[PDB]
Every structure is written in C-alpha cells, then in structure tokens.
Amino acid sequence: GVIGIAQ
Amino acid sequence: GVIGIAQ
Amino acid sequence: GVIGIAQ
Amino acid sequence: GVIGIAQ
Amino acid sequence: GVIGIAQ
Amino acid sequence: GVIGIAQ
Amino acid sequence: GVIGIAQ
Amino acid sequence: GVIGIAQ
Amino acid sequence: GVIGIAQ
Amino acid sequence: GVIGIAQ
C-alpha cells in the first residue's frame, strides 16, 4: 500500500 | 490501498 | 480502497 | 509498501 | 519497502 | 477539528 | 486538529 | 496537530 | 505536531 | 515535532 503526508 | 493527506 | 483528505 | 512525509 | 522523510 | 475513520 | 485512521 | 494511522 | 504510523 | 513508524 501507499501512505503520503504533505504539511 | 492508498491514504493521502494534504495540510 | 482509497482515503484522501485535503485541508 | 511506501511511506513518504513532506514537512 | 520505502520510507522517505523531508524536513 | 476532528476526523476519525474506522474500517 | 486531529486525524486518526484504523484499518 | 496529530495524525495517527493503524494498519 | 505528531505523526505516528503502526503496520 | 515527532514522527514514529512501527513495521
């Protein structure tokens, strides 16, 4: 799977 | 699956 | 599945 | 899988 | 797998 | 605010 | 804020 | 803020 | 802030 | 801040 987080 | 979070 | 969250 | 985090 | 973190 | 998701 | 996801 | 993800 | 991920 | 990842 894929987890991506932009802050 | 895919989880993506933009802040 | 897909979860996407834009803030 | 893939985890990517941008701050 | 792949973990990448940009600060 | 608060967002919570249970699958 | 708070985001929490359980799979 | 807080982001937490359980798989 | 806090980011925590359990797989 | 704090980033923690358990695999």
Q: Which chain I residue's Cα is nearest to H1? A: I1
> In terms of DSSP bridges, do strands C2-6 and J2-6 run parallel, antiparallel, or are they unpaired?
unpaired
Cβ–Cβ gap C7/B3 under 8 Å? no
Going by C-alpha positions, the residue among I3, D1, E1 that lies closest to residue J5 is I3
Resolution in Å equals 1.9
CA distances from A4 to C1, J2, J7 (A): 15, 16, 16
How many contacts does I have with J, using Cβ atoms within 8 A? 19
Structure solved via: X-ray
Chain I positions touching A3 (Cβ under 8 A) are: 5
CB I1 within 8 Å of CB G1: no
Does C6 contact B2 at a Cβ distance shorter than 8 Å?
no
Three-class DSSP category at J7: coil
